[PDB]
Design goal:
CATH topology of the largest domain in chain A: Rossmann fold
CATH class of the largest domain in chain A: Alpha Beta
Subcellular location (chains A, B): Cytoplasm
Order of helices and strands of chain A: EHEHEHHHEHEHHHHH
Oligomer: homodimer
Distance between the termini of chain A: 34 Å
Number of domains of chain A: 2
Largest interface: A-B, 52 and 53 residues
CATH architecture of the largest domain in chain A: 3-Layer(aba) Sandwich
GO biological process, one term (chains A, B): tryptophanyl-tRNA aminoacylation
Family (chains A, B): Belongs to the class-I aminoacyl-tRNA synthetase family.
GO cellular component, one term (chains A, B): cytosol
Binding site for L-tryptophan (chains A, B): 132
Bound molecules: adenosine-5'-triphosphate
Strand order of the largest sheet of chain A: 1-2-3
CATH superfamily of the largest domain in chain A: HUPs
């Protein structure tokens, strides 16, 4: 089947936004495509990290992924640093990307108007991200609009290597999520929901306890028109909710609209709060099981093991081409 | 015993000056210290290379180091890329070095007044060479006057890492060469003897056939005085010759002068042409034996293997502190 590569930043907290937005679709797609979910712990190292925290967020995230329903028999789920071929392909690639490309990388604005105290890893992580992808011949990479630009580079590098040394890499393609379900903030209906929002009430975490979920939805921003009707502009808040509610409950917006035909936001919120709680419960359970179970490690081991197998071979062929070793 | 790291750039050609200057004394040192001779092929890929040429120059250099007398049992001789820890620790160091530090590197001027068509390799190799070293808890890095600047940075990286994550690395020290002589060009006695020279007549390669060694020592510049006497200034060419001669024949300069008392350059050169031919003959022999012998690979194998045993335990502790993996 085709292959799909997904790099997951280790952050131990994914919003109901990631879930609706992409996570969910994978639980299904994982039986059709060949999927690799790499906990890129080497990329997370370019910025300060607290050793313990990082070590912890890598478990939390793997645990989570399995809970949501990723099938370790069906797909490969590994930590990035446990497959050395990654760091090796990173260097080989660092050698064919010209320095200009990295600087003209629309993200290096982190230069801080002359801060100059940035970790070189910050200017150099693209070659590594290119490695990550090219190593498994991935055909598709599910990236957001914000990323596209990086997938552009790896497309380039790949083509550059392929031409200089011979067809070896598959030129990937940046695919997006199923469109329509763009989950906005709870406190600001125009802003996208993200872990990185400074207001905790703008997002709900898969591990938010009932009470928290209830409190946050209650605070969700609405309008004063008081009618449950979909309106991208004019009625943003209500429309965001309607999307969340729908995607999770499985009802159409129209259905939800009519069903709340003569009611107001008070009851609507209370009903939504519940369908959310009802949707996370099994996840928070399974997650906790996964976290304390020794089975996690085993799944991570057989994951690396499955990854490494492919990587090793890819690296081996690269060295052959480049002309390294023996 | 103290450890000594020495990275050998694969080039398949080392000059009689390099042999005299450093190499020759290594066969001695190799008993008083713990030596690691790394054929650094990952660094050699920062600039265009022909794969076949590179694969070849890697064997050549190894065949030659043993030919010259390096004891694979006493010291460790390995290719850089056959020990993954290098490439791995490279990435971790890149994550703790500031961009400024890399740019202010007195050598990055290769950026050619706005060239930008330079591999990221040129800018980022330091973190790798820092790893090359640090990974072996080395004490002395035998460098040139010019290399010193790089040792400084790696010494820094060492400390930074030690203070942030704990005493783990050994701060290395950059020792200078033995020599007390220095070998000049054969075509220009003011220049230094080197493989990078555009005129072949300027140096003698440990693998130059006798007919060539003859033809190159003939051409060597002398003065017009016609006397074989040492004079740094005034008689540069003759002094250089006299230098090459002495070191290889164990005869003092005072002696050689007295010896050639009333003779001219004609004979002297012819004599010199011989002492060199004789000195290199066994070397070309041994070298050739190694080149067609499978024992060569077995030696590189047990080399990598001996090295990897130390490198891995270093990367393990490294990842441990950084908080990577499990
Ligand atoms: N609010 C959202 N609405 C729709 N899709 C989302 C949303 N948040 C994340 N996603 C999707 O989920 C996947 C991304 O997650 P990540 O978790 O890396 O996203 P971010 O939005 O980039 O980060 P964060 O969630 O930490 O703010 C992406 O492929 C993206 O398309
Ligand atoms: N002419 C020389 N005189 C003394 N020592 C030399 C000479 N050439 C090389 N060496 C020794 O070899 C080591 C250096 O490098 P290299 O092998 O880099 O030199 P080259 O042979 O001059 O090559 P290149 O200049 O192309 O880098 C030095 O640290 C030095 O000890």
């Amino acid at each position: 089947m085709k292959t799909i590569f997904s790099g997951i930043q280790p952050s131990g907290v994914i919003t109901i936004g990631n879930y609706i937005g992409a996570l969910r679709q994978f639980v299904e797609l994982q039986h059709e495509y060949n999927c690799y979910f790499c906990i890129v712990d080497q990329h997370a190292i370019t910025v300060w990290q607290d050793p313990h925290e990082l070590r912890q967020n890598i478990r939390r995230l793997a645990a989570l992924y399995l809970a949501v329903g990723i099938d370790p028999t069906q797909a490969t789920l590994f930590i990035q640093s446990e497959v050395p071929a990654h760091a090796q392909a990173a260097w080989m690639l660092q050698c064919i990307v010209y320095i200009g490309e990295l600087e003209r990388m629309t993200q290096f604005k982190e230069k801080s108007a002359g801060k100059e105290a940035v970790s070189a890893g910050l200017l150099t992580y693209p070659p590594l991200m290119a490695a990550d992808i090219l190593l498994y011949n991935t055909d598709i990479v599910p990236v957001g609009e914000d990323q596209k630009q990086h997938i552009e580079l790896t497309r380039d590098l790949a083509e550059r290597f392929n031409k200089r040394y011979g067809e070896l890499f598959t030129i990937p393609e940046a695919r997006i999520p199923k469109v329509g379900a763009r989950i906005m903030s709870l406190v600001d209906p125009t802003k996208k929901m993200s872990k990185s929002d400074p207001n905790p009430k703008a997002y709900i975490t898969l591990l938010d306890d009932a009470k928290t979920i209830e409190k946050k939805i209650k605070s969700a921003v609405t309008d004063s028109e008081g009618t449950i009707r979909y309106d991208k502009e004019a009625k943003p808040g209500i429309s965001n909710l309607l999307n969340i509610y729908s995607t999770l409950s499985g009802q159409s917006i129209e259905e939800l609209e009519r069903q709340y035909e003569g009611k107001g936001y008070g009851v609507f919120k209370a009903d939504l709060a519940q369908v959310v709680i009802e949707t996370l419960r099994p996840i928070q359970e399974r997650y906790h099981h996964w976290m304390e179970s020794e089975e996690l490690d085993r799944v991570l081991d057989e994951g690396a093991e499955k990854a490494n197998r492919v990587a090793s071979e890819m690296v081996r062929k690269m060295e052959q081409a480049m002309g390294l070793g023996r």
